[PDB]
């Protein structure tokens, strides 16, 4: 009846911002940050075991340099929100901190390494994220490791499995996702865990990412709940 | 505008028959490859480039024997009517033919190899398809290619990369789905070509597949135009 593991991509934040009259579009990034918070308290509160949330893909690192810098500082803001020791929250990184800078990189390892590993509720938060790269990444990791094991060149052809993938992931040992959200009315994909939404339930609202209300996280769980 | 791909998931054969009335749910499968072959008209004579259609996943072969013998049949005769050569079409066969049997993989076999090479129209029928397996069958293939170059185990590594992948899937020298198509309500994903859709556009309706008329066809090149 109820998700394990819910996936969220935050969508609109820029819209909202528009929609609303803001000529700084960071004023839709705070908001999201804001609802991102909400969600993650709505989800423990419901029982929902591991929550992921959508941050920053890599598609969004290619925009302008100052606008980009801001939206990373809001993110980093929204990890340490995420991470306080109030929470008791288990929180994970999946992505690459590679591509952040190497401040907020500090900053979002601190914060995510201060967190139990063992708790009642998991929050991931996708930060320099994409779906193929990975599935990549997770190759690479396994052939490297069998290498280190003395696996032939020809035992590396073979070597790779789906488990060993699954085992590969940034989202190593955890339950995939039951239930994806996208807001904005996307019903487009984007790649967001690829490989392990490949058997999730969809779920869509209209309404933009920083517009999300516990109202339509409501709906999102009694839809799931009927499917 | 157009898809250039269009991806069918043709859900709730089953429910349709349920639905209506039908103790034998088989029949489901006969309205439903009726409108397989409807459906890949519409395609050809709207513009569309290329349509996958999914007709048996790695999980639907574990049903009872009855009905899985009555869809391999079914299947079959939607594979060979695809082929007709008074069609014109090119046909790939995308899955593992090893999964259904050897005496209908040999019918399918033959009747997709009867098709052009070139043709305006394309049609993949997917058939013992996995996304998962797909990605890793890709993987492997691509890691042969190397070793067959003469990559040592070391380079092996390292010789993954997206671009590799994609070169290596069933779907190989072909566009990615613009559009997935999903009927019977359903919003929850499969597999279906798992690696490829990862940016598509899905596009829902509520009718079951045996139900889908071209008026819905055209609701969903209208909504996908407008996305
Ligand atoms: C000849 C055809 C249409 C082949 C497609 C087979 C595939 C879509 C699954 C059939 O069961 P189902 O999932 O459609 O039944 P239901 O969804 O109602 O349980
Ligand atoms: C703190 C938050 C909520 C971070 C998410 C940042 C990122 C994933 C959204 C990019 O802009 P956008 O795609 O939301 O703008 P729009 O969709 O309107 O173009």
């Given at each position: 009846d109820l998700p394990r593991h819910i996936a969220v991509l935050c969508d609109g934040n820029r819209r909202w911002a528009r929609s609303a009259g803001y000529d700084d579009v960071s004023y839709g990034y705070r908001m999201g940050a804001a609802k991102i918070a909400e969600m993650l308290r709505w989800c423990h509160e419901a029982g929902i075991e591991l929550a992921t949330v959508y941050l920053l893909s890599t598609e969004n690192l290619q925009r302008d340099p100052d606008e980009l810098a801001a939206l990373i500082e809001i993110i980093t803001d929204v990890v340490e929100e995420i991470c306080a020791p109030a929470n008791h929250w288990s929180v994970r990184t999946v992505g690459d901190l590679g591509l952040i800078g190497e401040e907020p990189a500090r900053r979002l390892r601190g914060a995510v390494e201060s967190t139990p590993e063992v708790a009642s509720f998991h929050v991931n938060v996708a930060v320099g994220y994409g779906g193929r790269r990975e599935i990549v990444d997770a190759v690479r990791a396994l052939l490297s490791k069998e290498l280190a094991n003395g696996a032939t060149a020809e035992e590396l052809v073979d070597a790779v499995t789906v488990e060993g993938i699954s085992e590969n992931?940034?989202?190593?040992g955890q339950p995939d996702p039951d239930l994806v959200i996208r807001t904005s009315g996307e019903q487009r994909l984007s790649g967001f865990l690829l490989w392990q939404s490949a058997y999730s339930e969809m779920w869509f609202t209209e309404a933009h990412w920083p517009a999300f209300r516990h109202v339509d996280f409501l709906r999102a769980l009694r839809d799931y709940s009927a499917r």
């Open positions: 992931l940034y989202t190593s």
